[PDB]
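Q: Second attempt. The first request was missing the SMILES, so the protein and nicotinamide-adenine-dinucleotide are both included now.
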Amino acid sequence: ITPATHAISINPATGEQLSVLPWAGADDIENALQLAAAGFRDWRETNIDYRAEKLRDIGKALRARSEEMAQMITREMGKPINQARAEVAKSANLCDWYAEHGPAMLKAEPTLVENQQAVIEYRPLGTILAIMPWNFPLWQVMRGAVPIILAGNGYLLKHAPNVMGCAQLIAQVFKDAGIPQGVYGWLNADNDGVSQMIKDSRIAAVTVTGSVRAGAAIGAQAGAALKKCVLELGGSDPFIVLNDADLELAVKAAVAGRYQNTGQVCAAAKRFIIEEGIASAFTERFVAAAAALKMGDPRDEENALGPMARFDLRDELHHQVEKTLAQGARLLLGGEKMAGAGNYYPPTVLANVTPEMTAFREEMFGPVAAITIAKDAEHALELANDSEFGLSATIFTTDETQARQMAARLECGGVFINGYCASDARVAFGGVKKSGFGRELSHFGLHEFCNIQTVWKDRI
Amino acid sequence: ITPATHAISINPATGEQLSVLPWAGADDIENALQLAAAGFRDWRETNIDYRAEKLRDIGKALRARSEEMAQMITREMGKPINQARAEVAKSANLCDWYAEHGPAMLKAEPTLVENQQAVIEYRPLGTILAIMPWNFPLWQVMRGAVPIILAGNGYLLKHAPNVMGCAQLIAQVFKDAGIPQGVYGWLNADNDGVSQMIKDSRIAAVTVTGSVRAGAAIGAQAGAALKKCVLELGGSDPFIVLNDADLELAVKAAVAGRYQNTGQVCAAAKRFIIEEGIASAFTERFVAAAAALKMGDPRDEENALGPMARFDLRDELHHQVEKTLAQGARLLLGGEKMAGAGNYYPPTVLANVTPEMTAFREEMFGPVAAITIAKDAEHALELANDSEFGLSATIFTTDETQARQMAARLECGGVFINGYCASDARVAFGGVKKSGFGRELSHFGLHEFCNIQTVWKDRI
Ligand SMILES: NC(=O)c1ccc[n+]([C@@H]2O[C@H](COP(=O)([O-])OP(=O)(O)OC[C@H]3O[C@@H](n4cnc5c(N)ncnc54)[C@H](O)[C@@H]3O)[C@@H](O)[C@H]2O)c1
Ligand SMILES: NC(=O)c1ccc[n+]([C@@H]2O[C@H](COP(=O)([O-])OP(=O)(O)OC[C@H]3O[C@@H](n4cnc5c(N)ncnc54)[C@H](O)[C@@H]3O)[C@@H](O)[C@H]2O)c1
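A: Got both inputs this time. The predicted holo structure:
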């Protein structure tokens, strides 16, 4: 059985095949679209406070299967089990947060028009097709599904083909919570099935979290079909350390930022850009700290890293490492595939990385840190912006004025000053350039898939 | 000299050729992109209060050329001169309105993160490519250029090829205002030139106002190049009149909404949907009121209608009329091309228009009213939503509770209850379905082309 006919799960820690699922056929797609249309037709007529209570029911149902869900995430894509538990906890908390704060964000807006003639209303658009990746099989889905559904939309999930066990368990959680199947639904569609759905009148808009190549392929189809899209396409985030930085905190945040989820994070710290005076001190401490990370069986809580999720992607990452070394970089740690049946790649550090090199210009979606030396803060900003990507960034410096000035000139959607980069319900998430466009979380994720409707009475 | 090599202006009132302009070549396009990039680089570093003052300077420069601008609009596309003067006045007022209210819309936004650690900032995105139409040759440009430039972006205009006299005069106004080189620019690009610019890294995003066909062609290219777009496309707005309406006001608003700018308005009232009990009285009054509209030389202020802008589009509109009559509609007024050198089409009314007919399913972009009988309010809503378009809508009824319930169920971006549909800086503008996506004016038009950036300090 090959991906020509089936979605396939393999445990990356052992190489064992776990499950197969054939692609949806024509009747499957038509049935999914009929369900979603009928579900949205009814859901859009519910009251906002009823939907807020249903979000709480989702959170309860998810917590009641928290360990079942975490084990499935770890089994299918290799995440350390405590990181999978944290992903569940964050996803369930998102349900409660939007239940509490979401309704107010959807209230009608007053305008400056006289006599209170005109208000802005947030109406639902319809069924939103969501194309999602494997690195956070639960959180990526919930990050969009929770606000999208609270706004009165429907959500139709096309999950990554290596995590359909996760997809089926998520569907069970929504069923446990009483969400209609025509409001949260899912389909094991192949790429042609996605193309067919984008063209169908029962899909109102599209959201994509994935590679740059996937976003360009889907975004072109959404545009041709006159469907709005949001694209979140990963990153090559710079992590800038200046001479006056809190060095020990910078190293802690650098290691956490690069090696979380075995490096497989869109907003991971990927390009370390260090002012020349502090570069030796940072580099030696970073290598020693990265070397302290244990790697192995992700069911063993002693391990900070598991295997990488996909065997072919470990091969690609190692090729990127070899090309960067051939171009002139120095290997300071790791940098070889581990022998054995599991898909393991050790924490790896490359130094003397210049902007011409593979590890500076491509997304390194695994546990490989690139370290580049900057002449001064202006050079560091130039190096940080010298990227096709633009998702987020970190700056470590005790000069808070300078940090604020650099943040204003960084070409990315998030800037973390002297701390740990992360997504959070309370703030906007999303980038610029080839990292995509559109924003998720806070009120942005609620409004992206609304029909923002002016209602104006007595304009005479 | 054919459209294969040149943009051509022809006076629609007389048929005489006014000007020709060859398409931009490869060097012209490259030059404009280099200057846009350099202009944006410097402009994004200016202070918001400085850019607000420059918006006031634009308004002063525009008012200083107000009659010259109005006469150019009338000469190139046929609009009654007092409507051209109103377009200039509304456009200059927009500059002052955004100068006054825009800066507060771009101030950092607090979040619920503890201890005031995180804010949302509104950063410039880059140079925005703008593809614009001929029906409001000044207002369509200013509606976007003013907020786009205020937010620190650049603006690169590709105007419709029959209004390049207007385009050159607008550029003179921005030059008179002292707007720096590259912050406002324009190109006489053919469709291939637009394609080349969308793929170029010096264009950050795209905004399109035009036909559904143009939006789908350009939106597909923007998606493939990973560029955000805002699409403001056609409309076929319904105008619903229920039995309990203020009939005299409904007729006045119906005639104004259909026949403004000789019918050539995206959000014109195009499909009149009249409850059966009041249909006879509405129809007889509407015909009488439309018949009272004078048509002729648009330099003469007695004329409520001018010629249509484009000879080929009058031919298209009359073909749509003839098809609708052949399908079974009845002609109540007008419905024939006027003889002579001018491009005149009289105020026209079609009755017994059913949902299967051309004038119900296509945008009627000229002075042709379609009247459809609804059995009751629920049928009227069904008829109103039975369209590929979804820009805006009007409801006339003294039952305000029913009007607001219907508004919530109308698939469009603006609903006017018992009044006159129009765009206004203080409210959102834009639609759903094949009318496109994204919103203009108010804070929406300011924020659509910002990089919405989280800045978070001390996340530890
Ligand atoms: N969070 C993220 O932004 C993210 C996640 C995973 C991978 N990536 C990047 O992509 C690289 C490859 O990873 P992947 O191979 O897992 O990513 P991908 O982009 O192939 O997959 C993400 C989703 O898009 C779907 N998809 C891809 N191409 C499609 C198409 N043409 N039509 C319809 N659906 C399509 C996939 O089935 C999956 O659901 C990674 O190495 C990393 O660089 C980024
Ligand atoms: N929603 C709105 O805000 C709004 C406002 C005004 C007009 N409109 C629509 O404008 C339409 C009439 O305008 P037009 O007659 O200028 O229509 P059009 O779509 O032919 O052209 C509009 C612009 O698009 C450009 N264009 C068209 N096809 C293109 C392509 N393939 N590549 C690049 N550029 C391309 C044209 O040169 C022109 O600049 C009507 O549908 C009206 O509703 C919409």
